[PDB]
From Swiss-Prot, chain A:
It comes from Escherichia coli (strain K12). GO terms for biological process: defense response to virus. Transmembrane segments: none annotated. This is Anti-bacteriophage protein A. The keyword NAD does not apply.
UniProtKB/Swiss-Prot annotation, chain B:
Belongs to the helicase family. This is Anti-bacteriophage protein B. Disulfide bonds: none annotated. Pfam families: DEAD (PF00270), Helicase_C (PF00271). InterPro entries: DEAD/DEAH_box_helicase_dom (IPR011545), Helicase_ATP-bd (IPR014001), Helicase_C-like (IPR001650), P-loop_NTPase (IPR027417), RNA-DNA_Helicase (IPR050699). Keywords: Antiviral defense, ATP-binding, Helicase, Hydrolase, Nucleotide-binding, Stress response. One of its GO terms (molecular function) is helicase activity. ATP binds at A121, P122, T123, S124, M125, G126, K127, S128. PANTHER family: ATP-DEPENDENT RNA AND DNA HELICASE, ATP-DEPENDENT RNA HELICASE SUPV3L1, MITOCHONDRIAL-RELATED. Part of an antiviral system composed of AbpA and AbpB; when both are expressed from a plasmid they confer resistance to phages T2, T4, T7 and lambda but not RB32 or RB69. Resistance is temperature dependent, it can be seen at 30 degrees Celsius but not at 37 or 42 degrees Celsius. The system impairs phage but not bacterial DNA synthesis (shown for T4, T7 and lambda). Partially suppressed by mutations in T4 gene 41, a replicative helicase.
Length: 531, 651
């Protein structure tokens, strides 16, 4: 016994606390129901584990005890109410795979020793058939109301033995420390903090404390993962405050080019277009403003949040004198960065809630195909749409003939995206987004699209040097530009009206006209060299 | 785990698609609890790049996502601005070619902020990057790196002399003095105890702390106490990790770090053979040696066991016999049937601790070059080896004497990383792998000893007669275990007399060794392999450190007895103590032996050149470098090769 012994807790409390710490680290665990501390009901994504904490005191756990029928009455014994009987009589409304687990401090006899090994390593080991028939004979071939046989209970049973309370405390505290490290990028200041978090979790489970220092429960007896995550985040930021460090907060990233007038689209609403002009500033275009706003998107587009917090962990002088050389080697490497930054910020500006940036890997005749600039949007009434983004900064030919070529290439990519039976890899790149089955069913590719074209949408950014926009402001750079971009968007209608190659896919266009993209690219190259 | 097991066990299957493997890797890297698992798979993907020649960018992105940034830098050529920038993020402050692992970066950030840091396990990540970064940030002045072995001290000294050559002055030998504000004290526990200038230390780094979790526990504890009371910051990277407590109540609030970052994938196959069953173990060695084809490191509990394993390995025809000037030198200087000699003649490399440092370096850089195939190490940390090995055969696991076990399924990956296994390593375990009073006794003896024999303890310069018996009787009581561990029995008190007479009458070390082997053959006739090992250990350890220590200890003890008994004879053993410490050389020259120059080579160097009596290791090394033309013309080829390797001279 460790800090639980000091506080005065029992084994079941620490088992429940260990399981909620597991939920803290395990992304697949959805909830940990706990009415009493010995009847844990861990609901995981696709499974439900009934964990029962038991203990004898004589020497060990023989078979007679596990089939012994509980008294539970005034000098009477209720039939079919043994430890095994209570284990199998564990109902679950959800159609989830049932798993059973018995956790005891005391060791296990040779008769039940087959249960100790994990079911994943029982293919060739003995101890199954005779144990099954002994249990069936002692229980008179019990079949439950759900048709659960004793053999079925045997195939799903993972009796765990813990040597003492301190061992469980150590696994729980290790879980807490590791969870802090990979959920907030923060190493706990001391062991006292980890022990305090463990004690607070124990108090929450046993309800032997005060409500403020407790994991929130919408209803009692059950704890959901997001509530525990928010409570743990509060504890971790408390650590960071009391340790003298500064809490990492994502900066309010600057709003790159503001949108145009009211969005314009097609009749069938499967084609969208939104211009993103930038206003002048006293007769002169704000090239410097656009460039130094874009260069703030150096870490949101290149890096990942887990390694973005490490940037914050750098003090000012190291942050200055580490990235002195330019990570860009050519102007054809800065143009791509700018073109994808504009789209990566346009998508965020267009959505009220912040989309989740992610990448997609798809095969093509056995060869890899990478797709950066992917996003997951959270449309709760409908699901979770996947926006696949393609950038382009045309500066060689006029946009009028280039746009159909871009659309053709987009259609080839789309046919290589949503027309396949082989799996697709989705690099979530957020570390905190739980991928629900709505998208995971498309990712696995096991089933053909059942009107899944609403789940996938493709967004394309097309920046171009417009003839109308010049270095002089040319009073009245509107009206004509509105019909110009309308004619440009009309290019995303010829295939829609004439035929249905992919006419059931919603496609977004983010056309942006500039006086000169080359000057902006040169300005961004100059600005990134300053850091 | 199920997805992890499927992806891992599908690696060898014929119907293998790398895309499903990378899908499993990404799925494992999405869930935090399976982070390490995905990382493990990536390691395997880094050892089988032929299978992933098509899906290279996916593997590179998985490598970046898992936090294996050194692998991202070194195993991949075509790098985007994204991964280049994140590599520049984790780039170490001391050099532009080394980057940080994620966990290493977190620990370095903890350390550079001034907080004491304790690691939860010696991990597969090499902590040398953290120490080099701490040196390269230009904030600390005086440091104390504690290392377990003198050879490791020399390796770290070379590492910290290549970089930070002029900024820091490195003190590794007692002859050196602190003449600069910035000083790195790369010492062992005993050296730290001896040094009397350990003050104002900024940060001391200790690895291999398992001795505190005997000759290695008391010394390490005393070194810890001294460095804690002297310094202000510490960085421990060893056991005593299970929620380390005790340093908190002593006024040292650390920041104990628990990690789950493993950079090495291992396929462990066990045999369950008990240690006592030697014949079954030998048959198992035959089987594995047939199985092992790549660079194999065989862990043994003793050098004799390694010799037996090498003899059996060459009995089965494993290894390519070859000859070179080095094997000729070893045969002509040590013996013909010595374990090292035959093993090197047949392509097997013994690397036990008692081996001379020059031969240790030769074995290490022979194994690193890939010329060797079976390196038989008797310690976990092999000084000088790089990440070459692919198989680790733990011939002996239960070393005994309260040692639970090495490679406890929580140490297998860390110890394998220490041994330097390239990504995926096959661990063939013969046994089953489990989880989890010096300064006061002499005067009491001298009280009984009468005035008749008192004349044998008060000498000056040249010793007198009948001193051998008295000294043997003294050493049979002061340090019985020191002489017993080398095969020299405590009683009768005659064999120590023979050893002392052999050392005294000998003019040079080589002649002493030849006489010792010529007598060891007679002794075994009433083998020669064990004799050389014990003799080398006796000369290096007993005759070098402990026996001179007791020779100096008896001085002040006998001074009081001479004063009390009225003896006016002078007391001075500078002729005897310094001669025994000097190994038949000038007093300071023997210090180059730790550098890696053989004593036999040092004798020829002494005869050829003129050595300063009061110079230190730095002065003697600079003297050798300056007068290279004098000895390079008229010395043996192997001798000058060893000198060049030891001093770092390029051609």
């Amino acid at each position: 016994g460790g800090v639980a012994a000091k506080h005065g807790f029992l084994f079941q409390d620490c088992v429940a606390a260990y399981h909620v710490t597991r939920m803290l680290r395990d992304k697949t665990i959805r909830s940990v129901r706990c009415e009493v501390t010995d009847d844990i009901d861990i609901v995981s994504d696709g499974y439900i584990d009934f964990v029962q904490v038991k203990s004898t005191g004589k020497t060990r756990w023989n078979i007679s005890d596990i089939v012994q029928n509980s008294k539970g009455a005034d000098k009477k014994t209720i039939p079919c109410s043994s430890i095994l009987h209570k284990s199998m009589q564990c109902e679950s409304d959800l159609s989830l795979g049932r798993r059973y687990s018995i956790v005891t401090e005391e060791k296990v006899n040779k008769t039940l020793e087959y249960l100790t090994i994990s079911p994943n390593a029982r293919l060739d080991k003995p101890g199954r058939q005779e144990l099954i028939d002994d249990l069936n004979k002692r229980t008179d071939n019990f079949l439950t109301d759900s048709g659960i046989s004793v053999s079925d209970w045997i195939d799903a049973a993972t009796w765990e033995v813990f040597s003492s309370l301190r061992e469980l405390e150590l696994l729980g505290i290790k879980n807490i420390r590791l969870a802090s490290q990979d959920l907030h990028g923060v190493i706990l200041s001391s062991e006292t903090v980890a022990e305090d978090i463990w004690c607070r979790i124990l108090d929450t489970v046993t309800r032997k404390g005060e409500h403020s220092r407790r994991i929130h429960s919408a209803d009692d007896k059950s704890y959901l993962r997001p509530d525990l995550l928010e409570w743990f985040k509060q504890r971790v930021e408390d650590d960071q405050s009391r340790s003298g460090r500064k809490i990492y907060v994502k900066r309010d990233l600057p709003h790159i080019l503001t949108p145009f007038r009211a969005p314009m689209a097609s009749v069938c609403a499967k084609r969208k277009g939104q211009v993103l002009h930038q206003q002048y500033s006293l007769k002169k275009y704000r090239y410097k403003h656009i460039a130094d706003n874009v260069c703030q998107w150096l870490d949101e587009v290149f890096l990942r949040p887990k390694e973005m917090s490490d940037i914050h962990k750098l003090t000012f002088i190291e942050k200055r004198e580490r990235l002195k050389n330019s990570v860009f080697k050519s102007l054809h490497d800065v143009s791509e960065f700018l073109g994808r930054v504009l789209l990566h910020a346009t998508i965020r500006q267009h959505h009220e809630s912040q989309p989740i940036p992610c990448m997609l890997y798809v095969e093509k005749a056995g060869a890899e195909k990478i797709l950066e600039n992917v996003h997951i949007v959270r449309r709760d009434p409908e699901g979770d749409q996947l926006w696949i983004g393609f950038s382009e900064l045309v500066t060689d030919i006029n946009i009028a003939v280039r746009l159909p070529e871009i659309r053709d290439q987009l259609y080839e990519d789309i046919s290589d995206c949503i027309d396949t039976a082989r799996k697709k890899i989705l690099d979530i790149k957020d570390d905190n987004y739980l991928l629900r089955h709505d998208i995971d069913e498309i990712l696995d590719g096991s089933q053909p699209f059942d009107a899944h074209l609403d789940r996938f949408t493709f967004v394309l950014f097309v920046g171009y040097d417009s003839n109308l926009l010049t270095e002089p402001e040319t009073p009245g750079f509107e009206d004509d530009l509105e019909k110009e971009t309308a004619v440009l968007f009309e290019k995303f209608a010829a295939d829609l009206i004439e035929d249905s190659p992919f006419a059931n896919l919603c496609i977004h266009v983010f056309i942006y006209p500039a006086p000169s993209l080359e000057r902006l690219t040169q300005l961004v190259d100059e600005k990134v060299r300053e850091v | 785990t199920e997805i992890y097991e499927q992806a891992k066990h599908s690696l060898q299957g014929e119907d293998f698609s790398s895309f499903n493997y990378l899908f499993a890797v990404n799925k494992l890297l999405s869930n935090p609890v399976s982070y390490d698992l995905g990382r493990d798979l990536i390691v395997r993907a880094l050892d089988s790049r032929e299978r992933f020649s098509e899906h290279t960018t996916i593997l590179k992105n998985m490598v970046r996502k898992s936090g294996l940034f050194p692998y991202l830098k070194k195993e991949f050529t075509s790098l985007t601005p994204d991964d280049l920038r994140v590599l520049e993020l984790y780039r170490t402050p001391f050099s532009d070619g080394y980057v940080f692992h994620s966990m290493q970066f977190h620990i370095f950030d903890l350390l550079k902020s001034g907080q004491n840091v304790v690691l939860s396990a010696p991990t597969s990540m090499g902590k040398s990057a953290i120490v080099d970064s701490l040196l390269g940030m230009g904030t600390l002045k005086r440091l104390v790196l504690v290392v377990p072995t003198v050879a490791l001290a020399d390796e770290t000294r070379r590492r910290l002399q290549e970089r930070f050559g002029d900024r820091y002055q490195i003190i590794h030998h007692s002859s050196q003095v602190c003449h600069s504000d910035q000083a790195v004290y790369v010492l062992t526990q005993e050296r730290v105890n001896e040094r009397d200038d350990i003050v104002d230390i900024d940060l001391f780094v200790i690895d291999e702390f398992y001795k505190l979790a005997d000759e290695r526990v008391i010394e390490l504890n005393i070194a810890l106490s001294k460095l804690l009371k002297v310094s202000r910051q510490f960085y421990l990277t060893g056991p005593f990790v299970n929620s380390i407590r005790g340093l908190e109540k002593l006024g040292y609030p650390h920041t104990f770090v628990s990690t789950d970052f493993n950079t090495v994938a291992l396929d462990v196959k066990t045999f369950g053979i008990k240690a006592n069953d030697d014949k079954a173990k030998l048959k198992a060695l035959g089987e594995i040696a047939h199985a092992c084809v790549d660079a194999t490191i065989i862990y043994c509990k003793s050098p004799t066991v390694a010799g037996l394993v090498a003899r059996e390995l060459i009995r089965l025809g494993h290894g390519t016999p070859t000859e070179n000037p080095h094997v000729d030198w070893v045969s002509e200087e040590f013996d013909a049937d010595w374990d090292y000699t035959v093993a090197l003649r047949n392509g097997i490399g013994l690397h036990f601790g008692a081996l001379p440092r020059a031969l240790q370096q030769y074995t290490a850089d022979q194994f690193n070059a890939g010329k060797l195939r079976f390196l038989l190490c008797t310690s976990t940390i092999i000084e000088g080896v790089n990440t070459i090995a692919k198989n680790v055969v733990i011939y002996d696991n239960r070393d005994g004497t309260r040692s639970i076990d090495k490679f406890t399924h929580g140490n297998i990956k860390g110890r394998a990383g220490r041994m330097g296994v390239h990504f995926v390593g096959k661990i063939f375990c013969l046994e089953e792998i489990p989880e989890d009073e010096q300064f006061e006794m002499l005067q009491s003896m001298f009280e009984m000893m009468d005035d008749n024999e008192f004349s044998s303890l008060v000498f000056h310069w040249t010793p007198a007669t009948n001193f051998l018996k008295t000294f043997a009787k003294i050493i049979a009581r002061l340090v019985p275990h020191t002489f017993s561990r080398n095969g020299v029995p405590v009683k009768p008190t005659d064999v120590m007399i023979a050893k002392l007479a052999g050392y005294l009458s000998a003019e040079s070390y080589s002649e002493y060794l030849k006489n010792q082997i010529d007598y060891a053959r007679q002794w075994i006739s009433e083998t020669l392999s064990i004799a050389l090992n014990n003799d080398l250990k006796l000369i290096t350890n007993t005759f070098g450190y402990t026996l001179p220590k007791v020779l100096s200890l008896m001085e002040d003890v006998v001074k009081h007895h001479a004063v009390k008994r009225g003896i006016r004879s002078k007391v001075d053993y500078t002729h005897v103590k310094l001669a025994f410490e000097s190994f038949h050389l000038p007093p300071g020259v023997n210090a180059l032996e730790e550098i890696g120059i053989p004593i036999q080579t040092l004798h020829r160097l002494v005869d050829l050149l003129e050595f300063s009596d009061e110079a230190d290791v730095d002065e003697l090394s600079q003297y050798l470098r300056d007068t290279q033309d004098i000895w390079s013309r008229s010395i043996g080829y192997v001798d000058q090769m060893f000198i060049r390797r030891a001093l770092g001279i390029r051609r």
